[PDB]
Amino acid sequence: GTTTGGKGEIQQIASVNHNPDALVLNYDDRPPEATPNGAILASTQYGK
Amino acid sequence: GGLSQLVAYGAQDVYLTGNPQITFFKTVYRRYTNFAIESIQQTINGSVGFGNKVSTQISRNGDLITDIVVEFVLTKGGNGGTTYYPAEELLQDVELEIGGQRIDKHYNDWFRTYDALFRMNDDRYNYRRMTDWVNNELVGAQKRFYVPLIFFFNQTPGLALPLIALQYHEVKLYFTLASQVQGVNYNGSSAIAGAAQPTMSVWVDYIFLDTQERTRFAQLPHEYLIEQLQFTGSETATPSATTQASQNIRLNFNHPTKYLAWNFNNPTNYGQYTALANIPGACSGAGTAAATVTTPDYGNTGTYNEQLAVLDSAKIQLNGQDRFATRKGSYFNKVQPYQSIGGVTPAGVYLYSFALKPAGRQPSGTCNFSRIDNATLSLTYKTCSIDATSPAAVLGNTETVTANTATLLTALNIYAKNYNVLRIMSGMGGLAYA
Amino acid sequence: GGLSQLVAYGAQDVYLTGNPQITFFKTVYRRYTNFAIESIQQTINGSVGFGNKVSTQISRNGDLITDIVVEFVLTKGGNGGTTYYPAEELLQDVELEIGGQRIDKHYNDWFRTYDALFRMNDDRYNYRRMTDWVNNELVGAQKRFYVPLIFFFNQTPGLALPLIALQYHEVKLYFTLASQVQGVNYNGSSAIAGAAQPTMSVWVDYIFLDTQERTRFAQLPHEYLIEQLQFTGSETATPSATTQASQNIRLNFNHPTKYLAWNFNNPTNYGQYTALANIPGACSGAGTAAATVTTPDYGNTGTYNEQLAVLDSAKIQLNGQDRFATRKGSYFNKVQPYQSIGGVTPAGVYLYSFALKPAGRQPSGTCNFSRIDNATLSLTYKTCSIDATSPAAVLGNTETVTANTATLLTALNIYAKNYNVLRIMSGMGGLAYAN
Amino acid sequence: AGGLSQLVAYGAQDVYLTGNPQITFFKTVYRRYTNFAIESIQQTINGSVGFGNKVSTQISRNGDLITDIVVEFVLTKGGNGGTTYYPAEELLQDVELEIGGQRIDKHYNDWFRTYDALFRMNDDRYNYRRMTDWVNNELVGAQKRFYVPLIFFFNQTPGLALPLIALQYHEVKLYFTLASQVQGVNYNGSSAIAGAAQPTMSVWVDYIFLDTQERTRFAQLPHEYLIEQLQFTGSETATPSATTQASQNIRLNFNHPTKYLAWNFNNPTNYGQYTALANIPGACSGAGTAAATVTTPDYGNTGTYNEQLAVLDSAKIQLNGQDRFATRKGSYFNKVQPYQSIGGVTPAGVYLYSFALKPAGRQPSGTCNFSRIDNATLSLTYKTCSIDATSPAAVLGNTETVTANTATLLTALNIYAKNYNVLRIMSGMGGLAYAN
Amino acid sequence: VGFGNKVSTQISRNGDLITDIVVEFVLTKGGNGGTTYYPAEELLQDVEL
Amino acid sequence: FYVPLIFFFNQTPGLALPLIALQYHEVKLYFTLASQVQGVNYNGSSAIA
Amino acid sequence: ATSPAAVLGNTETVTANTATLLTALNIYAKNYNVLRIMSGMGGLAYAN
Amino acid sequence: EIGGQRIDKHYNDWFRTYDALFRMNDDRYNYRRMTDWVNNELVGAQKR
Amino acid sequence: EIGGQRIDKHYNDWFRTYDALFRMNDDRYNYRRMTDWVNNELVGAQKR
């Protein structure tokens, strides 16, 4: 046995088969949309 | 003199002084963008009081927002030592919201956990000074308290929210005030007659920029690397005798995560993370005939004696595969804070990091739970066999047992501190991965 | 094991581990210019004693100057608990001069404020160890003290003062030694017979440079980012009953300012910024029948109970306009040093910063008072109605009141730290701006 | 009004501050890093663990990089409150770091006590204490797990992580010497504590796993690490009881660009005692009462800050017979130098002189290379030990040049040098660039 | 709304021009005749526009 | 009670605030309410129960 | 539990009062994995 | 463990469950002979 | 209101008119359940 010191652990396969990325909604699937801020516009259309 | 060691020069200096790059005695300082900081009161929606909810609508007085400090006025209804961070307990939680999307959510226990881990002796005491009664004050004393908030941009000017470029969003803070705060309107579970309702204001520090930077921030898109807090509470089964109970906690987290931290608390006594015992500072009246181990000596609620800590051992398991060998509870209380923060953590609060320096803002290693199907935290508890009223056992027993009073620490608070990105696009803001 | 996380990466990692730019696990160090540090004594000109003035010139024994430490040897004239930083109150007035041009000027009260405001943890505890008796010592004890100076070139090598570049402009240090030291010459205002005069020595730390860089320092013009202290004394008049004062103290400062800090002191005692009261740490004999609230338990003069302070609220005005909204004294004592310093500021010492990092050296926000004609610090005071001798009232009252002994804090000390630019060329130098 | 006014108040003094801006504070750009995972793995300890035994462990090359290493001890108390003082630290008598059959560094319990005593601060120094001692007045029979971190060159920053992957052809080992006498656990002074249990030890090593691109770089490219080493030999002191202030001229045998020199004056009977014992609070067993005895410390408070219990009056370093700096008083090296160079507090009896601007830092900042110096000496002047240790009137009430009669027990002189060397790694094998 | 509280309002943008603004308070008298003096504005400690 | 405000646009229409022309700003008023108001919640310094 | 007449004489749906002592639940699964060895290194193919 | 990687892990209780399930006849009896005191041995008896 | 412009207003004695006119049996009763004490509750009873 050549192991006077050792060699590091071999990479093994750890796949994703359940849904741990669930509930993660990115800016690409849905982008942000506007809501009011501090500056407000007047009641522009008062009806007839 | 010093010339003697300059003469003492040789081959070994080729790695130190030969062909130099820098000099230590002529610093070149960089010129910075002109800014000024104001601190103004905000508009606080809602009725202020115990158990009530209120909110803050952030004004657009400035260009960037950085430090948010919540101000309270409280009157103490008890004697000295009957309180333990009442300004922090009062602020039961805060949600930060941009355009209807939650960016972060903090809890009173999280603030306590953060101070327990990442604050240090001077700033931790100054924190205590602005959140608690620290000078042996007596009943009827009035004191103004401050609870600085710790969102990703708080105390972090580099991530200040670009309000000038959020002219299409509400930026809001939703606060929940506690229904019971120890020492000011309840003593344990008993109401204090005549207790005064708190007075509240949220103070916000605005950064004002010069002509050119205001243009840059208003017109250009931005990518902000931000922090978030993930949380849900759960119950534990703390063992009585003849057994060391285990519990498998299912972790429910979704972002590159820098660390997992947790504590075990008695929900009836804010900040109590250890068992009560008839030893100095470990319970009300400790050391005297009037000592009781049902009620803490609240001002000394935090301790460092891990024998009063409930956790025996823990490990983090990912997809059924152990991430590291089992550690005893003191590992998470004393070592990871040493390695990862450089400060002292009181008994009852535990930390395991994925990051080399989680206290910093530069990412240094994360665990992406979004690519891990089944992560769990395995907890083994200490047997609660020590009679809490007998110092002979409390200060003199084996590492695997704790006090009979530890069975009251039935709530687990599991936190994950993670990273996310806040995107600013055409004046609109929200998360890159929500 | 950890490989379970190594492989487990996805879309949320592209901004963390995608196309890596840095590694945490291979550092490269920058090589520097060979130098040596040496600490030598300067020749002291003048009679050393209490109330005497003394000067020394920094001899050209090196290329750059960094730290300077003033040495005292004192004998305590009182019993235990009668002193409060004797070494720095003795070091009453330290003036830095280059070629006849004043560069900076520090006071003993600033040294106390700096230690109280910007030093932290073990740094300020050791500072006290170098300046006071901290182990219950008795009358007659002899101790050697070191008061480091905190000028612009004293706190970091990066601004070392290049004497090699100043061969025509003598650099001198002027000292005044206090006529009174609490616990060494006087117990309160009562003289201590037989008190010894101090022994003093000024030590200066020299940097020796390598030939190539030494040559460049001597020949090339230089500019240094230099920090200054501005000060003048003020007076206040805090009321005892039914009223609260409001002062508007004009801020006679004139260069880019990092922060303003101030305190309220009792001129009789050194370092006292709070009221005396019959509670631990605020009264000689506190808690006993012989408790006297005329003088403190001097060894514990500093306290943290802000209701012993006189400042209720303050705001700064620039051009007669508010600079920020009025905040309570606890904001300036607790909240501002928390955000800007991260330390513990004792009661009675107050800070408002203009900078993100006032404790740092890299400029990070200033108020340029050179372009502001009128500025004032507005101070609203507490009513000093509490009987200092009754803990029931001292420890159990409202926000807006303090002890009747608080009215002794009649001296108002407002400090400003600012930037200037130090110009050195052809062996001559001095400040850049003068206003 | 407000900050808007402050921005308008722009003038000539600002061209050196905000004119032609180069940076801002409110748009921080963070760097993207190489993917890695941290895993802490238990090592096997070869040998029988116990008091007076020597054991060793070989680090299994499980990961690619090594950084922190923590020695975990399980100890029980043999005494009551105040009878211990860093029992975990005195047990870790020494640790030898060996890479490929050759020594890189060796630390001693007394060094760990010095490193703790002058470099880390109140906050983590107390946690360090929490990890090494009983700090809650625990009584006889208490069991506690102790964590003694190692402070080798590769664990004070990831940038100096030890790349085992690049050392493919040989082992890295740690040799541990466990003290035979541990105050308050196995011995109480010179008296053995009957029934004392043997320690259990585990050595935890923290591994880093690298991704494909960087793991390859580490395996194939050569490396040059600029690392720290400790140098140490012991000597004996000449501490007089009366009529004189003795001097010694101690010849130094150090050999690399040195960052600093630190020294202790120890009482080998106990652990960590660098000051005299006296009948004043915390200065001896029973202090303040009629039972006070000044031959034995009140161990849990062994460290103090009272300079009058120290024995060093003054010290100077000479190189090849010339003064390196003018003679300084003992308080200079105890308080002024760590103030100037570290920023913490050094307890009485521990002294440091730096050659470095930032000796607690990793980047070189000034060194004295004793490899080019022949006659380098440390000259030490002692205080006369004439004070009666049992009389506070003198212990707390005498002059600078005299100390307690019990001070003559500080007979061991411990001088440490911290220096640079370079650890080079080529073709799977590592080694030091400079010998001696 | 209450004693020692700070409240604010933005003007609801119903109209084109704003002229007067009148603040109403409803108070309960704590004493008999002659015990008050301008309590409505005493209460209105300040207004910042 | 009624407390009219007396700002620059409150007492005469010729100075009426043209909100219609200020569509990029909010206009807001901060109202600070005194903690101690004589005869309704304090009589001198004494609180009215 | 102390009366054989009941312990040895009852219905499917009942057991002894002493059964409440059986407080710990241990569920074990036996599964496959693949152990790979190549050029001197070894490890499991799948981690999950 | 092989190369730092866990391959399997067994508990004392698993050893008994395994015996309780998969061994049969006199192998379980010989097993007990290896693991227990099966001949009414008395206090002080020493066995391999 | 929307933008300061009133859209609608409801009154006491309208809710009773609507409930007494458009809500039918189960949905009118369930509405009562949400707004009244319908179980002969005594003084001191608390409901949401």
Side-chain angles (χ1 to χ4, degrees), chain D residues 380-391:
Chain D
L380 303 170
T381 299
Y382 298 93
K383 294 182 181 180
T384 299
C385 304
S386 64
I387 292 170
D388 182 337
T390 64
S391 178

Side-chain angles (χ1 to χ4, degrees), chain A residues 34-40, chain B residues 60 167-171:
Chain A
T35 69
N37 69 94
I40 304 296
Chain B
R60 299 291 187 280
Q167 292 183 31
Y168 290 96
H169 291 241
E170 296 184 326
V171 178

Side-chain angles (χ1 to χ4, degrees), chain E residues 14-44:
Chain E
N14 282 94
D16 302 318
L17 310 176
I18 307 300
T19 60
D20 198 7
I21 300 172
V22 179
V23 181
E24 287 179 351
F25 298 96
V26 180
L27 289 98
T28 302
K29 195 175 187 178
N32 292 327
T35 60
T36 66
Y37 189 74
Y38 288 81
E41 62 184 29
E42 178 180 354
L43 174 61
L44 182 63

